[model samples]
Target: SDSKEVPSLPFLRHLLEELDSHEDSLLLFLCHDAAPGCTTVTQALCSLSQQRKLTLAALVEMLYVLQRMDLLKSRFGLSKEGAEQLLGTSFLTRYRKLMVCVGEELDSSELRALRLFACNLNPSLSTALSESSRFVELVLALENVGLVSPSSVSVLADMLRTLRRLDLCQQLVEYEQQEQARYRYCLHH
Candidate 1:
């Protein structure tokens, strides 16, 4: 069996290396960074990847590449720790907003978007969306480099699914308020 080709550098580095190789590898390198210069770099890499597929070593490699580009930080300028904390808090905030939307008045547009997005995702994940708390963070993180995992995708799918199910969405909002009230506004600025 051919040995697994591990990527040592960031997605950009791997792309560079692959560019040096023969002309049949059509790899695509994708990076999700919010940094300044990183956007241009990411776009360049994406263009290259579109032309020639890019192979990365792991999800971490992609994240590290973003780190190298200095392109991914939240509004508060926090790193991994800050990001995770913020995500946790955001999940609660969204949950609260969700409840407000449902109990007060059903915003048909928001509701419709949630349901449509959910339906677009995988079904099994919809069941998993509310099974645990970290599902929210996992899904958002998965949107970035190094956050994408087999479980993350399913979790994301489920989250989208959960949003579509208005009944369950309402129930989830109520349950969280009752059980995880303290979790609201728990993140750092």
Candidate 2:
């Protein structure tokens, strides 16, 4: 109910906050060696929106890559069908699908075991990681930091064996075995 306007802002400034949680991984998806924080992500997004260099398709692509399709739904009323049309096809990289595959078969066994492994990495992470958090979240943490990936999950499998969760390790190995066989079919990635 005032007179003149001071200036205009942008939608992404706040929306970027929602994405701050995935700042590292998102930046990783763009490239690698991310030393900066959410500030970097915010700046990257702002610039991408500024010039003609931006691709709106890629904007939705990132949310899909992050599996924040829900965010797309909430904000833009978009979903998989729209995303497919936006991009003209699915955008998931092979490593992306592989991570989801492994994490999907995971069991939240021995909450103690997960934190024990995590706390071995750091003191506070166990609280941040737990049985309550799905396996994919932890896998993303490792993926974000470059510890695990599509063909390189042997490291995590090795870690699982070290933890004597060979039951979990067995499943991990079987998943990879199935993946190896499927890769022979026509993954072509």
Q: How many steric overlaps does candidate 1 have?
A: 13
CA RMSD (A), model 1: 16.8
Would you list the clashing residue pairs of candidate 2? none
lDDT of 1 by residue, 36-149 (tens): 123344454554344332232222233332332232242124465433442322112333223222323334454445434543554433543342213222233334343233
Q: Which ten residues in a row have the lowest lDDT in candidate 1?
A: 20-29
RMSD of each: 16.8, 9.1
Those runs of model 1 whose alpha carbons end farther than 4 Å from true positions after fitting are 1-37, 41-151, 165-189
Q: Best-fitting candidate, measured by lDDT?
A: 2
For each candidate, what TM-score against the reference?
0.20, 0.43
**Clash totals for all models, in order?**
13, 0
lDDT agreement with native, every candidate? 0.34, 0.55
